[PDB]
Design a protein around this ligand. Structure first.
Ligand SMILES: Nc1ncnc2c1ncn2[C@@H]1O[C@H](COP(=O)(O)OP(=O)(O)O)[C@@H](O)[C@H]1O
Ligand SMILES: Nc1ncnc2c1ncn2[C@@H]1O[C@H](COP(=O)(O)OP(=O)(O)O)[C@@H](O)[C@H]1O
Ligand SMILES: C[C@@](O)(CCOP(=O)(O)OP(=O)(O)O)CC(=O)O
Ligand SMILES: C[C@@](O)(CCOP(=O)(O)OP(=O)(O)O)CC(=O)O
Ligand SMILES: [Co+2]
Ligand SMILES: [Co+2]
Ligand SMILES: [Co+2]
Ligand SMILES: [Co+2]
Lengths: 327, 327
């Protein structure tokens, strides 16, 4: 009386940010978002549901996770057990090939992989659309890691209509790269979930964010259709700066940036000034991601090595959607 | 046929920021502001109007200023010459005891001192209120350096009704201190005037700024009446963060912060956590000012010496209003 399943999902980095939930229970977002799934960082997860288990167990990077660290996995397991009428405790064994809780989207790859493993184990036979909807319930960004390359999370207006899909770009995504500047791989002070809730509920800047996100998304789409790299980069750099601006208007205000974040951002502007087209974005933490055409990646890593070590510059290319495995 | 005059004015640091002009020609602000005039940084300026001069001359720190560097002094001289019907060129000799164009309010002390020197030389016999109105025409923050201690610039609605005045605080200002952390005394990339104009005209966050400034000012006034230091510090720290947030929503966005700015801000929060009540604010540049009660100033300088040199921690106390000199 045992059901098991496995999946691999890659991280994604948001080009147009998701920031703030319209519905906290179902993770319905205030705005639509768009990301690039990457090849460098991924999560591998197996789940086992077994009548003989006596409690839910979460093992991450070979390390048993404590009650606080398991609370959310347990929330996702409860949700999927209701969606199957399954009453069995589960064992979740996951390995993050990506720093955890550091602004490098380990919740995207991690909850996507768990959703996929659960889909397999409980024989749910979900379409990609419906697997995206389930992953959304664990972490918003995870619903986009179901797909490769460019993916859009349509905010919709209900559990049924909020989900992601691939954005065809006539192969453009394979002509691009993202260079991670690792300022700090440690666990971050304010979680993505808590930070965006504080922003929604208290930031005087949040309406400004909302009033600009759809225009940014439209221009990202026009840029894709024309493979206009400077236009893409200007939109996404400003979109990320606008998102981080919102936390300075929260009550109390806060920032995800660290000193090295600003150093890296300024350096990206120097690189542009000195003839390397590239644009930075930051998800919810201090690390800096630099969008750059593949042909300029080595140029950029060398430029940036003047201030960061080899261990701090990690390149990445477009990556695949989720991979399921019956075991 | 020569008229001469001299004045000394001290810098001020805004606790509630002025950010954005409702009228660029007359420097009427979008919101009222409140500052503390300080004893550590000041400007000394002499002006001479003489029928024999052949052009306006501006000498700053013993160095002749070029055309670009004199444009604004020339605008202030033209204005004051119209207000006297004087047709004579002038020589302005000024010494800044304060880094220039670095976010340490050298335009406040400098244009205040020039306004005072011109008042003297042309025998204008201005009340403090009217001298504040004239200094306002050279630099907004300068209209507050006419007064000592706490001073408020009332935005008014016309050249006649926009001016500053002292805020009585039952001696509280003499129980306080401000510690400057000098991250970079160099000349800054984006001027205060250009930065705030870009913000007014393009920032999606500017309305949020406007919608909160009057509430901040009110609470600063209640805190003064009760000498409530924690309440003052929380208001002013959030007000400064909100002001800097507005530039991340500008088009194109920008920041005045440098890496050391964030380091210093984080350290101030550590100091609070480890039992030293103190609060940071930043004017338009990378340097960080820390409001602190006098009794905790040495504690704080020692705490901060773990990461900054002696040459980077400059203390300051409340300072006087403008001093005029007939020569
Ligand atoms: N492999 C995983 N399986 C389950 N939950 C995970 C996994 N990796 C990360 N998480 C969850 O994601 C949280 C971090 O979420 P978030 O604050 O969005 O950070 P990040 O920048 O890593 O995406 C972790 O503390 C944990 O709750
Ligand atoms: N002593 C002075 N006399 C005249 N103008 C001055 C003086 N000191 C500074 N200024 C003007 O102020 C400008 C800096 O203004 P601002 O951008 O507000 O910088 P700050 O942070 O120093 O106040 C200088 O470039 C110059 O135009
Ligand atoms: C700024 C972002 O990186 C925030 C991602 O937040 P999460 O997707 O981690 O949050 P939850 O829905 O609470 O799990 C932008 C993005 O990934 O779209
Ligand atoms: C953020 C501030 O430091 C900006 C001061 O700007 P200025 O008074 O230098 O600007 P102008 O009116 O253009 O001369 C806040 C303040 O001093 O009130
Ligand atoms: Co996340
Ligand atoms: Co993200
Ligand atoms: Co100034
Ligand atoms: Co100022």
């Amino acid at each position: 009386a045992m059901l098991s399943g496995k999946a691999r999902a890659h991280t994604n980095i948001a080009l147009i940010k998701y920031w703030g939930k319209a519905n906290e229970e179902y993770i319905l977002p205030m705005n639509s978002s768009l990301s690039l799934t990457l090849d460098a960082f991924y999560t591998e997860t197996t789940v086992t549901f077994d009548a003989h288990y006596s409690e839910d167990v979460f093992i991450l990077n070979g390390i048993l996770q404590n009650e606080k660290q398991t609370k959310k996995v347990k929330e996702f397991l409860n949700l999927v057990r209701q969606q199957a009428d399954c009453t069995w405790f589960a064992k979740v064994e996951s390995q993050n090939f990506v720093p955890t809780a550091a602004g490098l989207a380990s919740s995207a790859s991690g909850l996507a992989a768990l959703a996929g493993a659960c889909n397999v184990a409980l024989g749910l036979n979900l379409s990609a659309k419906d697997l995206s909807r389930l992953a959304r319930r664990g972490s918003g960004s995870a619903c986009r890691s179901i797909f490769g390359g460019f993916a859009q999370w349509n905010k919709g207006h209900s559990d049924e209509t909020s989900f992601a899909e691939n954005i065809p770009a006539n192969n453009w995504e394979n002509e691009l790269a993202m260079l991670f500047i690792l300022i700090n791989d440690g666990e971050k002070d304010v979680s993505s979930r808590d930070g965006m809730k504080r922003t929604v509920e208290t930031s005087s800047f949040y309406q400004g964010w909302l009033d600009n996100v759809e225009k940014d998304l439209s221009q990202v789409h026009e840029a894709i259709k024309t493979k206009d790299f400077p236009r893409l980069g200007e939109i996404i750099e400003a979109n990320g700066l606008r998102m981080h601006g919102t936390t300075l208007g929260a009550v109390p205000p806060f920032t995800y940036w660290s000193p090295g974040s600003l150093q890296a951002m300024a350096l990206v502007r120097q690189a542009r000034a000195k003839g390397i087209p590239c644009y930075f974005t930051m998800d919810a933490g201090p690390n800096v991601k630099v969008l750059v055409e593949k042909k300029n990646l080595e140029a950029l890593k060398t430029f940036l090595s003047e201030h960061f070590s080899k261990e701090q510059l990690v390149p990445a290319f477009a990556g695949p959607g989720i991979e399921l495995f019956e075991t």
